[PDB]
């Protein structure tokens, strides 16, 4: 009789951007009061609906996607903005109806040396369309002669590691985005 905003906000392992974990929250009382009224976040930016008046609208299907991106790529998670995270990772559709909640978390996700587990796709031969998780790791060929199976000259493995340190600037730190797409 209350929607799971505990299984998706207070969690231990926010996924990596390439495999953004999406949960279907449905048939329950959602209280978007706790979320907006918490100052832990740092980019509530709600495109479509209005952050303030949000507890009343009966959203038909709430799909909380959740990932970890660079500390400066919070922009690429905004309807329209395009680049590495948008085109070759997670794309917020041109007409996104919902909010892009996000904390720049260092303590939890940054290791002195590098938590190399939060990953990100770079070289990708397909700008991902709205809400797509290209979990594949195909050795990307770019120059000419197909490598196929081997990494080397003019052949780069896509999924590159972020590697986050507790020293890195507030734009290179790990950022945990939880875009709350509504109907």
């Amino acid at each position, epitope marked *: 009789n209350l929607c799971p905003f505990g*299984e998706v906000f207070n969690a*231990t392992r926010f996924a990596s951007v390439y495999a953004w974990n999406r949960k279907r929250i449905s048939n329950c009382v959602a209280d978007y009061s706790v979320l907006y009224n918490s100052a832990s976040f740092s980019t509530f930016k709600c495109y479509g609906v209005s952050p303030t008046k949000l507890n009343d609208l009966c959203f038909t299907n709430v799909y909380a996607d959740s990932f970890v991106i660079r500390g400066d790529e919070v922009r690429q998670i905004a309807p329209g903005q395009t680049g590495n995270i948008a085109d070759y990772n997670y794309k917020l559709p041109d007409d996104f109806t919902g909010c892009v909640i996000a904390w720049n978390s260092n*303590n939890l996700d*940054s290791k*002195v040396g590098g*938590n190399y*587990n939060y990953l990100y796709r770079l070289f990708r031969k397909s700008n991902l369309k709205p809400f797509e998780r290209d979990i594949s790791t195909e050795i990307y060929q770019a120059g000419s002669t197909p490598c196929n199976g081997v990494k080397g000259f003019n052949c780069y493995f896509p999924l590159q590691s972020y590697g986050f340190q*507790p020293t890195y600037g507030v734009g290179y730190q790990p950022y945990r985005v939880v875009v709350l797409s509504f109907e």
Partner: antibody
Amino acid sequence: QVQLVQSGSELKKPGASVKVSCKASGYTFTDYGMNWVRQAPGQGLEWMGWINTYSGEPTYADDFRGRFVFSLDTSVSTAYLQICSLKAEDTAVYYCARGGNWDWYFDVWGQGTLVTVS
Amino acid sequence: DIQMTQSPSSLSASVGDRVTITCRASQSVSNFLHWYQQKPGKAPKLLIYYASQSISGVPSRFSGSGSGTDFTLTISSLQPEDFATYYCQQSNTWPLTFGQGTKLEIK
């Protein structure tokens, strides 16, 4: 050896402020966190919140929000805890437990500070 | 807040047998459920972590299995000197929550 010595069997009046020690050695102290669990005699372990061993931020568990604080004096390989304003319902052991940032499974090793109170 | 109930409370066993102790999480802990043991007057010890994989350096008489909200480790060869207050743990949602414990006893 990778073992976490702990402070001796404490005992204090209901209202003192005391500080158990978890001095580490053997691993890179910075690498993992420093969870702190407690266990009342007739009950079970309860996590109480860690401290990022490069900053010292005490992100306590949602229950032990108040009088407990974790004081990290790094470069000495120490991760002290400091219960404050002790009550008569805290007559429990308080363990150290190296549980990292990416793992969060403890290997709960703390010899156990027998914090009796009366 | 994850209400982790492990059952049965106190289940006796006899030497050399095979005993199963189960653990049920109120919400989903999907595959983060570690397993500890604690002989009295001791700091517990990890036994199974992520509910399937085994810790290196454990006497591998027991290993665990499960997923979702149903988890267990079954002692494939018990020996008397255990009587260990076994503990669940999850690692999915803060706060990490343990289980009260399935104390073992010989007849």
